[PDB]
Design a protein around this ligand. Sequence first.
Ligand code: SPH
Ligand code: SPH
Ligand code: K
Ligand code: K
Lengths: 265, 265, 186, 236, 236, 40, 40
Amino acid sequence: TIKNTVENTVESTHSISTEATPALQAAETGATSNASDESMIETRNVVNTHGVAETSLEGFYGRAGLVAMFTTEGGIRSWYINFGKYVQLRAKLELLTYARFDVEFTIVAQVVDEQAKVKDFNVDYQVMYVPPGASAPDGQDSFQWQSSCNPSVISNTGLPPARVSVPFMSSANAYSFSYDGYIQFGDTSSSSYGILPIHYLGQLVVRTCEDLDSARLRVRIYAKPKHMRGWIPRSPRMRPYVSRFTGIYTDAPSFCVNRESITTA
Amino acid sequence: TIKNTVENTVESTHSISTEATPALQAAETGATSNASDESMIETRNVVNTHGVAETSLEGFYGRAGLVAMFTTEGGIRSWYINFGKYVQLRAKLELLTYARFDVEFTIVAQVVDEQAKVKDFNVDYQVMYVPPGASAPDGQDSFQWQSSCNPSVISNTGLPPARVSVPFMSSANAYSFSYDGYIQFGDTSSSSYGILPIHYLGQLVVRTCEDLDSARLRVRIYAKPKHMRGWIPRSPRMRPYVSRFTGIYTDAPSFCVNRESITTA
Amino acid sequence: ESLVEINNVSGVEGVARYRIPLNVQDAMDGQIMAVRVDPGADGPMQSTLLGVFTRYYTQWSGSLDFTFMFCGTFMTTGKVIIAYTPPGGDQPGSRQQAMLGTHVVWDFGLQSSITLVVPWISSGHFRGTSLDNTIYKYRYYEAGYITMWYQTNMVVPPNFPTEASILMFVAAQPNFSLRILKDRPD
Amino acid sequence: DRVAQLTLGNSTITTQEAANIVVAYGRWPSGLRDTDATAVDKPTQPGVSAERFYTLPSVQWTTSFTGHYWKLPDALSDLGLFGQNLQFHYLYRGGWAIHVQCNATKFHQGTLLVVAVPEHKIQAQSNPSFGRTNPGEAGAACQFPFTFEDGTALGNALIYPHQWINLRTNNSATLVLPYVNAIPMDSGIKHNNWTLLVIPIVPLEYAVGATTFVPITVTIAPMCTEYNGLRAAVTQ
Amino acid sequence: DRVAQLTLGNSTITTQEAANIVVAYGRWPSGLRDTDATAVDKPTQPGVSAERFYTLPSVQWTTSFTGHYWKLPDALSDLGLFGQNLQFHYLYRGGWAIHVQCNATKFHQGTLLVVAVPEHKIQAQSNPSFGRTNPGEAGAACQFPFTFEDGTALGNALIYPHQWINLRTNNSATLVLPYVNAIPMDSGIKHNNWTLLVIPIVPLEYAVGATTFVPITVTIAPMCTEYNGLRAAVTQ
Amino acid sequence: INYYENAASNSLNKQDFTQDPDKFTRPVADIMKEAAVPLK
Amino acid sequence: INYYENAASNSLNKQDFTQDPDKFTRPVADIMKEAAVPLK
Ligand SMILES: CCCCCCCCCCCCC/C=C\[C@H](O)[C@H](N)CO
Ligand SMILES: CCCCCCCCCCCCC/C=C\[C@H](O)[C@H](N)CO
Ligand SMILES: [K+]
Ligand SMILES: [K+]
């Protein structure tokens, strides 16, 4: 059953009885306590109108965050599409085991000198999406940039940022943020463990349409999930990340700060 | 009862009587006089259609005014969100004890040389809102600028000005422009007096996305209240402000200009 | 419900930080533990489920559920008193001072566990999640303390273990809610 | 049943080895009627601030323990807003809920009588001291338990409301008392209506090497209270 | 009319040279509604023990008199059962009835403004002391009456609820104030909601040889009070 | 017509009336009519 | 009104309710009422 506000409070009087015992509990059973406030103290009436909308999945997930940041070398660079390099959005998506969503991508680009000092100079750029089994371009002027089948976006550093939507593209019925298994049959190698090849959907490749003199493009990508669905909440991550493609971590003897004694608040 | 125009005037004739005395009053009672014009002189009919709309709260408060003005140092600066630095909008809000309103913020930015002479140069800027208990960035390239949970706006010095709305965000049922009390229990220190921590909602932090050579950003912020509600009108401020966070003042022996004698207009 | 890291002191490491000690006394009315009830504050609560989600947001409202479980032998007995103290000063210094606020008396028997409910007693509709005093003076929002004392004593048979452990669970109640998302500082 | 939960104001008590609950003379606490009232001013009824459990300091069941007592309302006269309301007013009226606790293992044997007595005087000596007659929240020792401190047989105390704590059977005792007097209201500082007495009738013994230190603990609530005749604060 | 009688709890006040009664912002004191409430525990409402007149110590209208003030509820924080209820509880809410008295012959001339101000801060100095901000039941002197201690003109104080005592016309002033704040309840020990100020605007003068020593006296009642969050007693 | 989701997005109010000022100008317990004397 | 062909083009959902949490908080085969003792 569904609700748009939190629970109200009713009046409650004193109780002296053997028949009703709401304070006694048994944690062994695996259930969380069911003692209400009104059972434990004398309460007054409160009509409570606080809403629940900021903690919905759309509420928590529906805003853009950084996924990639790079510069061109010899008028080109490419990026493997994967949300592991920047930890803030990574740490939020690993609160669910399985999720389905669409994504809205935003691209921001600018010209820099060789000293990484920004330049007031407007240039045309191209982004191409290359799915697995397609040939990627080798350099700034390769003939794969015709883009007659592969999708492209073309734009200029003096217009506002580029933006496109993408639908739910997995071969599975949901993406997976945990996978306890191996990549393929007959390869139990330790580097083949805990990767699902089904989340890998390919590369983005970037170029300047013409050769800059001395300068380079710098590029940033932001991603925003839309229409979230989610199953099986996980325990939140509590140690630093180490690697882009694995959950590897180092141990330590505490999680919170220490104090002088257990009896001093 | 509610009105859309000021009061009309009726005809009035001479009166010679003991029974009716509208000119006599007693100021001691705490009430303002109730003598009408028609009671005090012979009047004619006037149908008066003057409206009352320019003196409504929406009328008086509903227009933008300056709240902040600063430059970046080493590609960054931050601002504590508080309307005390510029006295004109400060002096208007302290005409009410309690108010609820939404705010529309407008941001205007430009590039200057080291001699504070303006420069014809277009650059990308970012503004981030950091609520209390969140970590603020240390410098131009810190990893808190990923902005995956904290809201941001990104824009360019050659587009028109940035603008966003904000709703009524206090933990209280209204903001407070006077507070006769202390910040916390067991701290009656004189610097803890007359501040409400409940109006403090955090910082804005600003950077250039890339390093400028020699130049700096200069930035101005304007705020406009919308949908005002107000309770308990106060006496207007009549001495200069001295400090951003307190009502401190210096005394003086008059408020208006002097004249040669009480009998000379 | 999730476990609270309550024994956070210098020489205590790993799973031992989840246990509260009890032992057989030779004097009366002694103190077992203290902690501040504030869910977004740095300290024992910060690693809990309720603590991590509260650190994603700036404001909170609602009642809390604290639940305790005894892990001695079948033959071990005792009674303890658990109290919530609303704001206004320091933590209470004795069992008389503590029992003037909201409290429960717990008897160890067949049902292993007990709940104390910390009800929402506040001036405004919401409180801030940080309590950080250097910039915003947000120590204004401090929510009170919870403390535990001996009511009688822990009593055992001959040659038994004279020391036993409690475990402490925390959860939100159905009137609880959060506002204004922000980036988790961990 | 053997489980119980008592809830009053902001306070709650639980037990798992109860033995029913006694309600003295078959009456619960109640208000003063308009036919029986005499003072004409409007009474004060504080509600949940006064009517809640208070816990007194504990007593050790030693080898030499003869027994202990408390006077009501003397014992609570300086605690919380029950105390302050009683000092500020000339007249008081009300009832009580009482809960006595004492726990010990299956390797211990012993028995306590827990008894509430109306209008109990101390009289083994020509002239009782103020210390012996009004001992406060700490209570005082029984020096003469066999004659019940008053010149009657201990054996006949069961005409008053009582329970036993027998360590093989139970660990707590519970009594509910209404207001008793020859007048509708009275001074709280000059007259004690009830005394609560705890007397060992079978001494404490145990298997060799078992825990020796065993406390007894008393917890009390005012119930259905009213006050009249407000003035400055006054104490004996 | 010019006669009046005010009765609250066990207390009564009379006057024969009144000038009506003011009721601030057209509202009487009232209870907190179920839609506006937030704290979930059952409140305490003491009734006639708290809601009654208290009289503060008097002030002399000297030659050098610039004016005097009081903070509410600071002034009554240590008096009677209003005081004790406010120390024992975390939150408080309520309104006030106020009556100021000053009498002098038909051979005297002078005038006082009597004004109640919401959320009034003291700020002629960089750092107000605790003595100046919470002066207790004795009150404190105005050092800066022309700027109303706060950086506003004295002349514009009449936007707040007020009366005058003008010695040719009346000898008493009466104000009734409801609860005002941005929240439903608040701490009684950390925040003062109202200030009562008494300022001479025409100085005291008289026929040669008339009585020179003329006191001013302030009498105050709490009204429609409730408290939440009971604990031990706590003060600043 | 409103284009955005939250009411903070909407334009300024257009209900610019005034009301009877007696809560500030004549807040007294007993009525004193214009034609009469105030103190009697 | 939707301007584009595919649903991935549409704006964010506005159905921001909550539901009864018993699938995570009390997932037990036999019911245990508030007023009763759990183990009997
Ligand atoms: C021209 C615009 C470029 C658009 C390219 C779209 C490619 C499709 C991307 C879908 C998003 C996939 C997200 C799935 C899983 C995450 O990467 C996980 N962190 C994998 O561990
Ligand atoms: C990315 C855009 C930035 C928007 C940040 C919004 C923060 C919320 C600001 C709300 C306005 C608060 C006004 C309240 C009180 C005044 O500051 C008073 N002068 C305090 O004394
Ligand atoms: K509701
Ligand atoms: K008109």
